[PDB]
Write an enzyme that holds these catalytic residues in place. Structure first.
Site, PDB file in Angstrom:
ATOM      1  CG  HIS A  41      20.813  16.212 -17.779  1.00  0.00           C
ATOM      2  ND1 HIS A  41      19.549  15.783 -18.168  1.00  0.00           N
ATOM      3  CD2 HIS A  41      20.829  15.897 -19.329  1.00  0.00           C
ATOM      4  CE1 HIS A  41      18.843  15.602 -18.728  1.00  0.00           C
ATOM      5  NE2 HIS A  41      19.978  15.756 -19.444  1.00  0.00           N
ATOM      6  N   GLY A 137      17.869  14.064 -26.736  1.00  0.00           N
ATOM      7  CA  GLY A 137      17.784  15.136 -27.564  1.00  0.00           C
ATOM      8  C   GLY A 137      16.524  15.266 -27.414  1.00  0.00           C
ATOM      9  CB  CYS A 139      16.730  16.197 -22.030  1.00  0.00           C
ATOM     10  SG  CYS A 139      16.354  14.697 -21.291  1.00  0.00           S
TER      11      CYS A 139
HETATM   12  C1  LIG Z   1      17.439  13.965 -22.571  1.00  0.00           C
HETATM   13  O1  LIG Z   1      17.778  14.710 -24.098  1.00  0.00           O
HETATM   14  C2  LIG Z   1      17.269  12.393 -22.497  1.00  0.00           C
HETATM   15  C3  LIG Z   1      16.470  11.746 -22.903  1.00  0.00           C
HETATM   16  C4  LIG Z   1      16.572  10.592 -23.068  1.00  0.00           C
HETATM   17  C5  LIG Z   1      17.074   9.801 -23.981  1.00  0.00           C
HETATM   18  C6  LIG Z   1      16.339   8.599 -24.767  1.00  0.00           C
HETATM   19  N1  LIG Z   1      15.035   8.537 -24.046  1.00  0.00           N
HETATM   20  C7  LIG Z   1      14.826   9.546 -23.620  1.00  0.00           C
HETATM   21  O2  LIG Z   1      14.219  10.274 -22.655  1.00  0.00           O
HETATM   22  N2  LIG Z   1      17.346  12.258 -20.919  1.00  0.00           N
HETATM   23  C8  LIG Z   1      18.978  11.209 -20.889  1.00  0.00           C
HETATM   24  O3  LIG Z   1      20.067  10.976 -21.744  1.00  0.00           O
HETATM   25  C9  LIG Z   1      19.068  10.717 -19.421  1.00  0.00           C
HETATM   26  C10 LIG Z   1      20.437  11.536 -18.862  1.00  0.00           C
HETATM   27  C11 LIG Z   1      20.412  12.012 -17.413  1.00  0.00           C
HETATM   28  C12 LIG Z   1      20.180  10.620 -16.442  1.00  0.00           C
HETATM   29  C13 LIG Z   1      19.069  12.582 -16.420  1.00  0.00           C
HETATM   30  C14 LIG Z   1      21.630  12.625 -16.675  1.00  0.00           C
HETATM   31  N3  LIG Z   1      19.727   8.935 -18.900  1.00  0.00           N
HETATM   32  C15 LIG Z   1      18.279   8.398 -19.688  1.00  0.00           C
HETATM   33  O4  LIG Z   1      17.444   8.627 -19.631  1.00  0.00           O
HETATM   34  C16 LIG Z   1      18.995   7.298 -19.105  1.00  0.00           C
HETATM   35  N4  LIG Z   1      18.018   6.702 -17.761  1.00  0.00           N
HETATM   36  C17 LIG Z   1      18.076   6.638 -16.643  1.00  0.00           C
HETATM   37  O5  LIG Z   1      19.275   6.492 -16.703  1.00  0.00           O
HETATM   38  O6  LIG Z   1      17.548   5.814 -15.755  1.00  0.00           O
HETATM   39  C18 LIG Z   1      18.061   5.306 -14.653  1.00  0.00           C
HETATM   40  C19 LIG Z   1      18.572   3.759 -14.843  1.00  0.00           C
HETATM   41  C20 LIG Z   1      18.156   2.324 -14.913  1.00  0.00           C
HETATM   42  C21 LIG Z   1      18.852   1.318 -14.875  1.00  0.00           C
HETATM   43  C22 LIG Z   1      20.114   1.290 -15.614  1.00  0.00           C
HETATM   44  C23 LIG Z   1      20.843   2.776 -15.707  1.00  0.00           C
HETATM   45  C24 LIG Z   1      19.438   3.846 -15.431  1.00  0.00           C
HETATM   46  C25 LIG Z   1      18.285   5.959 -20.202  1.00  0.00           C
HETATM   47  C26 LIG Z   1      18.721   7.214 -21.744  1.00  0.00           C
HETATM   48  C27 LIG Z   1      20.003   5.976 -20.788  1.00  0.00           C
END
Ligand SMILES: *[C@H](O)[C@H](C[C@@H]1CCNC1=O)NC(=O)[C@H](CC(C)(C)C)NC(=O)[C@@H](NC(=O)OCc1ccccc1)C1CC1
Ligand SMILES: *[C@H](O)[C@H](C[C@@H]1CCNC1=O)NC(=O)[C@H](CC(C)(C)C)NC(=O)[C@@H](NC(=O)OCc1ccccc1)C1CC1
Lengths: 300, 300
Positions: A41, A137, A139
């Site tokens: 992603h 950030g 990830c």
């Molecule tokens: C990588 O840097 C980040 C790390 C996140 C940010 C804060 N803590 C973390 O571990 N990853 C993300 O931003 C992901 C992006 C995707 C989804 C992998 C493309 N987003 C998330 O972590 C989001 N989680 C999520 O979408 O889970 C399911 C969900 C549940 C309920 C409602 C909507 C979606 C979350 C940061 C917003």
């Protein structure tokens, strides 16, 4: 003596973290040999691999410190991008990629912008989440265990679930648990306590002088397991009992006496007392973790 | 999000650990530039100046992996030995020697025979002990903090006290607390809770979504103090309140209001509830640590 939540030393993994920038998204990558592994992603209901074919090699900025690694090719393996670069990382350790089982522990080297921020120990929960510490950030940060000199990467971070728990993949890109790298609703599922680990931690407590919780009631594995189910504990198996052998043999407390110890703690609580500085039954120490720490196993 | 007990990445310290053997006594040393620091009792109610003068540079096998280091001088600064050797460590990072105050935290890279075993965080308790994880052979292991790229060495291990806590020196060889490096009966002394740290961890909890313990009550600095001394908590100063400002402004919870929360927590307990996954009030997170973990700061 003493007992603490101990991570592996992270220098072997530090020397691999890179920054991967693409569009307006930045995250971390794992540089091994001439390959940079990162969460797919970074190229972002996506069709990732439609989105990937519309990408060029020069769209990927990979920065190993202040040196730009140039991508000569790329491919997608499930949820990870593999970026072929023009330089072999000379600090590449001996490594493997492994998929850990739930209940197993590993160290996480949390990174931001390619740079290590901190290291800490995690367990793979029974519900395939980890209770990490991860900000925007982070990830691409990896989890790992060391054996002797070889790094076994087992985790890469991708997402945070609403209950503040974290979800990710092995280095083959396959998620742990039923999570997808998509911003749609999904929930962690009900967790359970890793019983074999709790018992490991009680042995550690004995090995360190905490005996107040002991009794000499014994139990059967079946009678114990009836109690384990009542308190949301994973079932205890004979394989678990077997892995607990060395610990029992060093303390002289049979596994089934320590299970009877656990049962009275479960039914009566801890009644104002602490075990190894904790007021809860800790379940993120494997038996191997106890043995390694309480005997000073090191790594070349 | 998340909050876990997090160590600094250890690779900069890893490149400096060596094995020091003298007679039949082996422990760890810290090799910076062309000097190897180690606990002076490696030459062992002794008389260390007499014991040292009886030593020759060739009595010291300083062993760095599979590269024996030739000793070409020696000297004793308090409880540490300084072994000048014929090679400057190529992996010497930018470093400082700092003496830390109680309440301050650091990471410990536990080592054996010059090889890392693990990393973990600790605090300088107010009784100048630490709650570590140290076995026979771990002396010479260092505690440290990392700032941008600079390693501030602050601790070197020497000894375990009968309560299972650990005692040591700064890198100038001076013990923290009243302890001496000889097998004479000495006990830690009564410890107290680092109040400012508990308040900082309450804020970490808030930043991470645990608010159940908050209230709309407030208190004065002295009235909360009247309560801290009842519960063996250490005085809270106005210097501590200032240090909690950033956390206060980011959460909009005034410190004296967080003090009111902690006061209620002291008088009533947790009554079955957890904060950040602990059922005790944690005091080994400084305000620094909270802000750094809850904001993601890294180290090149
Ligand atoms: C990588 O840097 C980040 C790390 C996140 C940010 C804060 N803590 C973390 O571990 N990853 C993300 O931003 C992901 C992006 C995707 C989804 C992998 C493309 N987003 C998330 O972590 C989001 N989680 C999520 O979408 O889970 C399911 C969900 C549940 C309920 C409602 C909507 C979606 C979350 C940061 C917003
Ligand atoms: C260096 O490798 C070890 C590290 C110790 C060993 C176990 N855990 C540790 O952290 N240091 C020692 O072996 C010291 C040596 C001296 C005393 C510093 C020279 N010895 C101890 O730690 C011993 N404790 C001790 O002597 O404390 C004072 C005391 C208290 C009560 C009665 C007598 C003496 C103890 C580990 C054997």
């Amino acid at each position: 003596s003493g007992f603490r939540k101990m991570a592996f030393p992270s220098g072997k993994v530090e020397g691999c973290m890179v920054q991967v920038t693409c569009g307006t998204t930045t995250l971390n990558g794992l540089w091994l040999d001439d390959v940079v592994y990162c969460p797919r992603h970074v190229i972002c209901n996506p069709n990732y691999e439609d989105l990937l074919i519309r990408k060029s090699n020069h769209n990927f900025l990979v920065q190993a410190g202040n040196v730009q690694l140039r991508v000569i090719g790329h491919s997608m393996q499930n949820c990870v991008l593999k970026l072929k670069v023009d330089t072999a990382n000379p600090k590449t350790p001996k490594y493997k990629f492994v998929r850990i089982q739930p209940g197993q522990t590993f160290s996480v080297l949390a990174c931001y912008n390619g740079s290590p921020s901190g290291v800490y120990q995690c367990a793979m929960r029974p519900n395939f989440t980890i209770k990490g510490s991860f900000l925007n950030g982070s990830c691409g940060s990896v989890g790992f265990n060391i054996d002797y000199d070889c790094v076994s990467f087992c985790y890469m971070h991708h997402m945070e679930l609403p209950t503040g728990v974290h979800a990710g993949t092995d280095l083959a890109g396959n998620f742990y648990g039923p999570f997808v790298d998509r911003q749609t609703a999904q929930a962690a599922g009900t967790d359970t306590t890793i019983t074999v680990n709790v018992l490991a931690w009680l042995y550690a407590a004995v090995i360190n002088g905490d005996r107040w919780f002991l009794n000499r009631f014994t139990t059967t594995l079946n009678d114990f397991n009836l109690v384990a189910m009542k308190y949301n504990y994973e079932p205890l198996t004979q394989d678990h009992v077997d892995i607990l052998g060395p610990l029992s043999a060093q303390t002289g407390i049979a596994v089934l006496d320590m299970c009877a110890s656990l049962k009275e703690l479960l039914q009566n609580g801890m009644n104002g007392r602490t075990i190894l500085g904790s007021a809860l039954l800790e379940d993120e120490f494997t038996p191997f973790d106890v043995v390694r720490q309480c005997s000073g196993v090191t790594f070349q």
